[PDB]
Each structure stands twice: as C-alpha cells, then as structure tokens.
Amino acid sequence: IETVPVKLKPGMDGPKVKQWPLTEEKIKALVEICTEMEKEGKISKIGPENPYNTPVFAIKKKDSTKWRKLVDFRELNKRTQDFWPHPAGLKKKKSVTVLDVGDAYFSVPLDEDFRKYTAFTIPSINNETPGIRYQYNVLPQGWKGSPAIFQSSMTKILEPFKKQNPDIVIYQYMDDLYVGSDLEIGQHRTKIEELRQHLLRWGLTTPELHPDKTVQPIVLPEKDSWTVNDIQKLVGKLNWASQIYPGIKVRQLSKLLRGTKALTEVIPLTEEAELELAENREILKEPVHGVYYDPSKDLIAEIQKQGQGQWTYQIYQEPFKNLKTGKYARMRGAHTNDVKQLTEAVQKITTESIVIWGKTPKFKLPIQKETWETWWTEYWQATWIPEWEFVNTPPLVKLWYQ
Amino acid sequence: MVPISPIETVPVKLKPGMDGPKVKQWPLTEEKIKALVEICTEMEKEGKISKIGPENPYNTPVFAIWRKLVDFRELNKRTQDFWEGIPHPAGLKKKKSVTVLDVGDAYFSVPLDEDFRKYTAFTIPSINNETPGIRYQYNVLPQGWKGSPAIFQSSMTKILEPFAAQNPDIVIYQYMDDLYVGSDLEIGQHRTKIEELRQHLLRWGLTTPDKEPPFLWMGYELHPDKWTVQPIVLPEKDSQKLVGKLNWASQIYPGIKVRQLSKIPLTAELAENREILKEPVHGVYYDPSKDLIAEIQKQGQGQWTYQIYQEPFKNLKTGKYARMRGAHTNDVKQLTEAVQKITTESIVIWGKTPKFKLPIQKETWETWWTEYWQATWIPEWEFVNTPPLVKLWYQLEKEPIVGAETFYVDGAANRETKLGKAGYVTNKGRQKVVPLTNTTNQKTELQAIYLALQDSGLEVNIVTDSQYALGIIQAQPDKSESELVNQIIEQLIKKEKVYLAWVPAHKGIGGNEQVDKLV
Numbered sequence: 001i002e003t004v005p006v007k008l009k010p011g012m013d014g015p016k017v018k019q020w021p022l023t024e025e026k027i028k029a030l031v032e033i034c035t036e037m038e039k040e041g042k043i044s045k046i047g048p049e050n051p052y053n054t055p056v057f058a059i060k061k062k063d064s065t066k067w068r069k070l071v072d073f074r075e076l077n078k079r080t081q082d083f084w085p086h087p088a089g090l091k092k093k094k095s096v097t098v099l100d101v102g103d104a105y106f107s108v109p110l111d112e113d114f115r116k117y118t119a120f121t122i123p124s125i126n127n128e129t130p131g132i133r134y135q136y137n138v139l140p141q142g143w144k145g146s147p148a149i150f151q152s153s154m155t156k157i158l159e160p161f162k163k164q165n166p167d168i169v170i171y172q173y174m175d176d177l178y179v180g181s182d183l184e185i186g187q188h189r190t191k192i193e194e195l196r197q198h199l200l201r202w203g204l205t206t207p208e209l210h211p212d213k214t215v216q217p218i219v220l221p222e223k224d225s226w227t228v229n230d231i232q233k234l235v236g237k238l239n240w241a242s243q244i245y246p247g248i249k250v251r252q253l254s255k256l257l258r259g260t261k262a263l264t265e266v267i268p269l270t271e272e273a274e275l276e277l278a279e280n281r282e283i284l285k286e287p288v289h290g291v292y293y294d295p296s297k298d299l300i301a302e303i304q305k306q307g308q309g310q311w312t313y314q315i316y317q318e319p320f321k322n323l324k325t326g327k328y329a330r331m332r333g334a335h336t337n338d339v340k341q342l343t344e345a346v347q348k349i350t351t352e353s354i355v356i357w358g359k360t361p362k363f364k365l366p367i368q369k370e371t372w373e374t375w376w377t378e379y380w381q382a383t384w385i386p387e388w389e390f391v392n393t394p395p396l397v398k399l400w401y402q
Numbered sequence: 403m404v405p406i407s408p409i410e411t412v413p414v415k416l417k418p419g420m421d422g423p424k425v426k427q428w429p430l431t432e433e434k435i436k437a438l439v440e441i442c443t444e445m446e447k448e449g450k451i452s453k454i455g456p457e458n459p460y461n462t463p464v465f466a467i468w469r470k471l472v473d474f475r476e477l478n479k480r481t482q483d484f485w486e487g488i489p490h491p492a493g494l495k496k497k498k499s500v501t502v503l504d505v506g507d508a509y510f511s512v513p514l515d516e517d518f519r520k521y522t523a524f525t526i527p528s529i530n531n532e533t534p535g536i537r538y539q540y541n542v543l544p545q546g547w548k549g550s551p552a553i554f555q556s557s558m559t560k561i562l563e564p565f566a567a568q569n570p571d572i573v574i575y576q577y578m579d580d581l582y583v584g585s586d587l588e589i590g591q592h593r594t595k596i597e598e599l600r601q602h603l604l605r606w607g608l609t610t611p612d613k614e615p616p617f618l619w620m621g622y623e624l625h626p627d628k629w630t631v632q633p634i635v636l637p638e639k640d641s642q643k644l645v646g647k648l649n650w651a652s653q654i655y656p657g658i659k660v661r662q663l664s665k666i667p668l669t670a671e672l673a674e675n676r677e678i679l680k681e682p683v684h685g686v687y688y689d690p691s692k693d694l695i696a697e698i699q700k701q702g703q704g705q706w707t708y709q710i711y712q713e714p715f716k717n718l719k720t721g722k723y724a725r726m727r728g729a730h731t732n733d734v735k736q737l738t739e740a741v742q743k744i745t746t747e748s749i750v751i752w753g754k755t756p757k758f759k760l761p762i763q764k765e766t767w768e769t770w771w772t773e774y775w776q777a778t779w780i781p782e783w784e785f786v787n788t789p790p791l792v793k794l795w796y797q798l799e800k801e802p803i804v805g806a807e808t809f810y811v812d813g814a815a816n817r818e819t820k821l822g823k824a825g826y827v828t829n830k831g832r833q834k835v836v837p838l839t840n841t842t843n844q845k846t847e848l849q850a851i852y853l854a855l856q857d858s859g860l861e862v863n864i865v866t867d868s869q870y871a872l873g874i875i876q877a878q879p880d881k882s883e884s885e886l887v888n889q890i891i892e893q894l895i896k897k898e899k900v901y902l903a904w905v906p907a908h909k910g911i912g913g914n915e916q917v918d919k920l921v
C-alpha cells in the first residue's frame with residue numbers, strides 16, 4: 001500500500017549496462033510480455049531523460065512451453081544498498097522443493113524515486129527502430145531488494161502453514177521458496193500442494209532435491225600389479241593431496257621408481273611401500289583439518305570437464321580447504337553440447353550453494369569468454385544469475401578429481 | 403485556427419551538484435552585432451527564443467560567421483546524461499517504393515523544458531558597449547545542446563507510434579531531419595499513405611514540404627536492388643587510412659587483408675588489394691523467406707575471411723576475422739572464435755544464427771571437442787571442401803605405449819649466468835646432455851622435450867616434471883611465437899604415437915635426472 005524507502009549505496013550511480021543482441025523470437029516474446037505488463041501497470045514507458053539500463057532477455061523454464069522474461073539485475077544488485085537469516089537445517093533435510101514465487105512481488109509498489117534505476121530496453125533487430133524503453137513500477141523479479149521488502153508479507157502468509165507443519169523448513173532466496181521436509185516423498189508432494197493452495201488463498205500464485213552423501217573423499221587405486229606409470233601417477237596424486245592432508249608421504253613409493261624403467265613395466269611393491277600406501281589411505285579417510293565457513297568471504301566454485309558428460313566441481317573459500325566437492329554426470333538434452341552441459345552444471349552448483357549457505361559462488365569456468373558469452377543464455381532456466389570468470393590454462397589437477 | 407496537439411516536454415535537470423553556465427561574452431565587432439540582432443529578432447518572432455530580464459545570472463557565448471552560433475560547450479558539460487548502433491544495409495528488406503520527407507521544421511518545433519530554459523541564456527553585446535546587451539533564452543531545443551538529438555528523435559518516435567501501429571504494411575526510418583517511408587503497395591496506395599502521414603504530422607503542427615535513390619547514408623550507397631560501400635579507391639603512392647578504408651571495404655569486398663598494413667614504409671605489397679578494390683562489388687538485401695548461410699575460409703597468418711548469403715554467389719555481406727593476440731594458438735580455436743563473431747553479428751543484423759559452412763571435417767571437429775579440456779560448441783554447420791582444410795596436427799596418447807622407448811627428460815639453468823643444460827636418459831640406456839647459453843629454466847625444460855622427440859622412433863613415451871611444458875602442450879597449439887615450441891610441434895607432427903607423462907620434481911622418481919641437467 002505504501003512504498004518502502006529505497007536508495008543506492010553512497011557514491012554509486014545507477015547501472016548503465018549495455019543490452020546485448022537478442023534473436024527475433026526472443027524479441028517478439030518480450031514485446032508480448034511487456035505489452036501485457038504495461039496494461040497491468042507493472043512497467044511504464046520512459047523517456048530520454050533516463051540514462052540507466054539493465055540487460056533483459058527471455059528464457060523457457062523446465063516443463064513449460066511459455067517464454068519468460070529475465071532481467072540481469074547483477075549490476076543493480078551490487079549497487080543497491082544492503083537491506084537490514086539462513087537455516088542450517090535446510091541442507092540436512094531429506095528432501096527440498098523449490099517454488100517460484102516471483103509473481104508475488106508484483107503486487108507491491110516500488111519507491112517512485114528508485115524506479116528509474118530499473119530501466120531496461122527491448123532491442124530492435126538491426127538497430128532499425130529505437131529500443132522500447134521501460135522502467136518498473138512494482139518490485140521486479142531478480143532484484144535483491146524484492147524479497148527483502150516483501151519479507152514482512154511473506155512471514156504473514158507462512159505463519160499459518162508454519163504453525164500447522166512445524167517440521168517443515170522454509171527458506172526464501174530471490175524469487176524462490178525452498179521448502180524442505182524430513183518426511184517421505186509422498187508426504188512431501190502433498191504438503192507442497194497444501195502450501196501452494198495456502199498461498200493461492202492469500203492470492204499468491206505458485207506455478208526435487210536431496211542432499212549428497214559433503215567433500216567427496218580422495219581415493220587411491222587398489223591393484224595387484226602396478227606398472228611404473230601407475231606408480232608415477234599415484235605419487236603425483238599423493239604429492240597433490242599432501243597440500244591438503246598433513247602426513248602424506250611418498251618416499252617408499254618413489255623409491256620403487258628408482259632407475260630409468262620402461263613406463264609399462266610392472267614393479268612389485270616392497271612391504272615398506274604397501275604400508276606407506278596404507279598410511280596414506282587412512283589419512284585420506286579422515287576430514288580436512290580446520291575447514292570452516294566465513295560469511296564475510298566469497299565462495300569460489302571450480303568446474304572441470306572430465307569427458308563423456310561428466311563434470312567435477314569443488315566449492316571453497318581458501319585454496320585446499322574445500323567446503324563442498326561433487327560430480328555432475330547428467331546430460332539432459334545435452335549429450336552433444338558441452339556448453340549446455342556446463343550451463344546446467346553451473347545452475348545445479350548454484351542451487352546447491354543457495355541451500356547450504358544462502359548465497360551464490362563465483363565460478364571459474366573451463367571455457368573461453370567469447371564462447372560462453374555467446375551461448376549460456378540459450379540454456380539458462382533460473383531466475384538468479386551468479387558471477388563467473390574464465391580459465392584459459394589447463395589445470396594439471398583435472399584427473400586427480402577423476 | 404485548427405487546434406494543434408502539444409508536444410509533451412521532456413523533464414531535464416542539470417548534473418547533480420553542478421550549477422548552470424556562467425561564461426563571459428566575447429567582444430564583438432559592430433557589423434557582427436547588427437547581424438545577430440536581425441537573426442534573433444526573427445527567431446523571437448518565431449518563438450524559438452525570448453527576451454529575458456537581468457535576474458537570470460547565466461550566460462552562454464554567441465558568435466557570427468550571417469549565421470548565429472551559440473557555443474554550448476559549457477552547458478553541455480553541466481547537463482545531465484540522456485539515453486543515447488546504426489543499421490547495416492544487409493539487414494534492410496527491399497520495398498517497391500521508398501519516399502523521403504523533410505521534418506527539419508519539427509526540430510525547432512520541439513519545446514524545451516521550462517525550468518531548464520534559464521540555463522540557455524545568451525547575450526548580444528551592444529554597440530560600443532554603451533547600453534546593456536540584449537538578453538535571450540531558448541524555448542526550443544538549441545542546435546548544439548547536449549540533449550537535442552535524444553529529445554528530438556524521442557519526440558518524433560512518440561508522434562509516429564500510432565501511425566506505424568495502424569499501418570503495419572509500411573515502414574518508417576528516422577535519420578537526421580528526414581523520414582524514410584517504404585512499402586510494397588501499388589504506387590497509388592503508397593502515395594496515399596504518404597498523405598495520411600503528412601495529415602498525421604499536421605495534428606502536431608508539423609509542416610513537410612512537397613533525395614532520389616541511390617541514397618547516400620553513413621558511408622553506403624543504397625539502391626533499389628543492391629547496396630555497396632560509397633566508392634572506395636585504393637591510393638597510388640610512393641611514400642592507417644588504408645587500414646580504415648580496407649576495413650570499411652572488407653564488409654562487402656571479399657578477401658581484403660590488413661595484417662601487414664595493420665603492422666614507417668616497409669613490406670605488404672597483398673597490399674595492392676586493387677584487383678578487387680578496383681572492380682565494383684555489391685551486396686543484396688535480406689529476404690526473410692530464404693535461409694541464411696555463412697561460409698569461412700582460412701587465409702593464413704591468423705587471418706580468416708567469410709561470406710554471408712542466402713543464394714549462392716549473391717552475398718548479403720562479407721567480413722574478416724583476425725586471430726587474437728596470444729603466445730600459442732591453433733586453427734580450430736581460431737575458427738571457433740570466428741564462428742562466435744559471425745554468430746553475434748548475424749543476430750544483430752537479422753535476428754537469427756546463420757547456417758555455417760566450414761572447412762573442417764565432421765570427424766575432425768568431433769575428435770576435437772570430445773578431447774578438449776575446455777567446453778566448446780559451434781552452432782549447426784556442415785563441412786565444405788575448400789582447401790586449406792582445418793585439421794588436427796597431432797594427438798597425444800592417453801595410456802603409455804607398450805614397446806616404445808621411455809625418455810626421462812630434464813632441463814635446468816642458472817639465473818645469473820644464463821647457463822643451463824637439457825637432456826634425457828631412457829630405459830635402453832640412451833642418454834644425452836646438451837649445454838646451453840643464454841637460457842632459462844623454462845627454455846631448458848622445453849629443449850629437453852625437443853631432444854627426446856628428435857632422438858626417438860615414431861612411437862615414444864616422454865616423462866617430464868615441467869608443469870610449464872605440460873601447460874603449453876595440453877593447450878594443443880599448432881603454431882607458436884617461440885621457435886622452440888614450433889620445433890616441438892613440428893616433431894610431434896612426424897611421430898606416430900606420443901605419450902607425455904608428468905611427475906613431481908625432486909621426489910625421487912627415477913630417470914628424473916635433475917642432477918645431469920644441473921651439473
């Protein structure tokens with residue numbers, strides 16, 4: 001009813017981000033979507049006195065054949081003033097369901113002075129006509145201040161359902177509700193429908209996740225016959241692991257490699273070497289020492305392409321102190337397209353990271369900037385977008401995660 | 403008196419914390435002052451300016467050349483920012499008729515925000531400076547003010563929006579003080595619709611009088627059936643401008659090359675370029691009913707050329723791509739990058755990705771992307787058999803080779819003396835150490851691998867501890883800046899099977915002969 005006061009950070013101006021080129025079908029979808037939002041009053045045409053801009057594009061979520069508008073509010077989010085909690089138990093729940101609650105924000109007006117900062121441009125093919133320029137009147141999807149503002153009304157719609165089901169953990173990140181239950185799968189599917197119906201009673205309209213078994217162990221081969229090459233790779237992996245785990249030792253194993261032998265020759269292990277291997281195995285079973293999470297520091301996610309649709313990743317804040325490692329091997333309409341696979345892996349790792357820590361990591365992508373920047377929007381399906389950078393030098397460590 | 407619809411003004415404000423301009427008026431001559439007074443009197447009689455009292459404390463200088471020139475550089479420095487990409491002719495769609503209209507009278511018919519007029523004040527000095535100068539402020543967008551182009555085009559666009567919506571069968575393009583209207587209707591109906599547009603512009607009090615293709619626009623020539631760059635003639639000289647004009651010509655003239663001239667007389671002469679830059683070439687216009695095709699050729703030295711077309715031999719446009727500046731590279735990476743650029747340019751100009759025709763075999767591309775450590779992708783494409791074909795020049799083994807000699811290599815160098823050594827020991831007892839001057843650890847680690855490649859059979863296993871060397875070879879270059887790397891590449895091309903294994907240094911792995919190399 002009454003707009004909440006909102007301002008930018010001190011010394012910062014509104015965003016002025018270039019709109020990137022869209023295909024004709026995406027432009028037409030945005031034209032139809034935006035024409036409808038104008039009629040509903042959610043956006044309004046603006047004039048040349050507004051210099052700000054945020055990129056816009058279009059997507060199709062999963063199991064839907066309807067175009068959807070996504071605004072890349074990353075710059076505005078960075079420049080938007082911090083707004084004055086994360087549940088540690090959502091990660092521990094047996095199952096967690098993710099609900100798009102984006103339409104709820106549109107029922108809330110936006111502070112008139114701030115609207116100019118939500119400006120965006122539907123572009124024209126071939127720069128023929130001028131871009132259609134709009135700004136938001138209501139809380140926009142993907143703005144960080146939209147859940148912060150709507151939060152008071154969200155607690156009001158939740159408290160009835162929450163009192164009725166107190167074993168349900170509920171969490172809100174951007175345009176999504178994360179609802180976790182320790183119940184059985186049939187018990188979950190029903191309660192989520194009950195929560196959506198409860199939302200629909202308050203006017204809210206809502207159009208699968210289970211925790212992994214956190215840091216995957218480093219494992220060493222078990223062979224009856226080691227070649228020279230087998231033992232060279234073992235020593236390489238053990239040397240690498242020694243940066244992470246204290247008492248890894250390679251002396252007895254390296255001693256076998258003494259002399260200049262053929263790479264395919266079988267070397268029998270001495271009894272001192274088998275014990276050293278066994279001591280290193282035991283070391284590797286224990287956890288890394290002194291691994292904590294610091295909410296002041298950024299999360300960093302590294303991804304390696306392992307081939308055949310397999311991808312490894314590690315999340316960490318400090319090198320060799322992994323908070324989470326994983327392996328994504330699903331090719332969903334992607335077995336011929338690396339970039340689609342990478343884009344889906346980035347979205348899964350980001351979701352994992354939202355559940356565990358309630359914020360997105362900074363990705364280090366095994367891909368050239370120009371290829372990634374040309375294609376990722378074609379396969380994007382989430383309402384948030386994380387940050388990324390590009391690795392152009394092949395990490396030696398790729399196989400040690402394979 | 404027919405009531406004219408008012409043109410809504412655009413609210414304008416100055417930059418935050420900045421006040422209006424206060425520049426001192428330059429002393430003028432007596433005839434200049436008389437000239438300015440006549441001009442401003444007719445402008446005032448027309449509404450463009452208005453006399454102001456002395457409360458207004460702002461001033462912008464004025465000059466005469468008559469013509470009045472108000473120098474708004476200072477007010478522009480203090481005016482807010484405004485929302486600011488030109489069409490490409492190969493994107494235009496042919497029309498049976500295209501009419502041009504003059505809307506220059508509307509520029510001086512777009513009002514200026516009232517609260518901002520005071521900032522536009524200017525003073526005509528008086529004769530012999532014995533009276534107070536005449537004081538005027540603008541009521542319309544001053545030519546030369548910062549916001550005039552953006553506010554003007556924006557005001558016209560709002561005016562034409564209903565007309566373009568009620569007439570989907572025509573097309574309107576705004577450029578400078580002229581409007582371009584085209585359609586595919588019969589010459590009768592098309593001239594009718596032009597009269598409706600003049601009627602519609604009269605509802606805002608805009609007068610249009612009552613160019614002839616080819617149009618000359620932004621360095622192009624636009625004909626009813628073809629387009630081309632405005633005539634480009636290569637220069638004849640004995641002793642940058644040739645770069646820009648060739649880059650400009652490259653968009654239509656296929657095969658322009660600019661590397662050595664992009665690289666102070668020298669040679670270049672390719673730099674003739676006349677062969678084509680002397681015969682006349684034209685591109686066609688876009689037909690949305692036909693498919694869109696892009697074809698790339700390798701030209702050598704990191705250079706690539708491409709044509710975009712819909713029917714064979716009638717190009718919409720052409721272009722080139724230059725390798726990115728780097729230390730190592732290969733042809734597939736370059737071709738990939740060229741594909742990405744043509745992809746983005748095509749989405750700009752036609753709103754879709756072209757179908758690609760590429761000089762690479764399907765099997766070559768599959769081997770590449772399945773084994774490349776990065777993710778990579780090119781959109782739908784088919785092989786075209788136009789030499790030189792892009793190919794993989796070597797492929798390292800995944801497993802050690804049985805029966806192939808194992809070379810343990812190492813190099814090392816002294817930071818002060820620049821003296822080092824490179825060499826190998828193998829399982830057959832073969833051995834070599836070469837002494838080197840003016841070298842580094844990095845170069846000796848490469849040279850050791852090179853020696854093993856030179857002195858081994860067609861199949862060989864090589865063991866190094868150089869993370870630096872593995873970093874380079876795992877990038878799969880086919881060409882380098884370093885002649886060492888290029889010699890390793892040339893050796894790798896001649897082998898049948900190469901297996902490269904890495905071990906950690908100074909951990910007691912045998913054969914890893916840091917002692918011979920550090921002697």
Ligand SMILES: C=CC(=O)N(C)CCOc1ccc(Cl)c(Oc2cc(Cl)cc(C#N)c2)c1
Pocket residue numbers: 489494495496497498499500573574575577582583584615617618619624625626627687
């Ligand atoms: C009859 C001509 C024709 O069919 N031609 C030129 C090719 C298609 O070309 C068009 C079509 C429609 C318009 Cl409305 C247009 O008008 C413009 C566009 C631009 Cl980008 C610049 C100028 C100028 N200065 C005029 C050209």
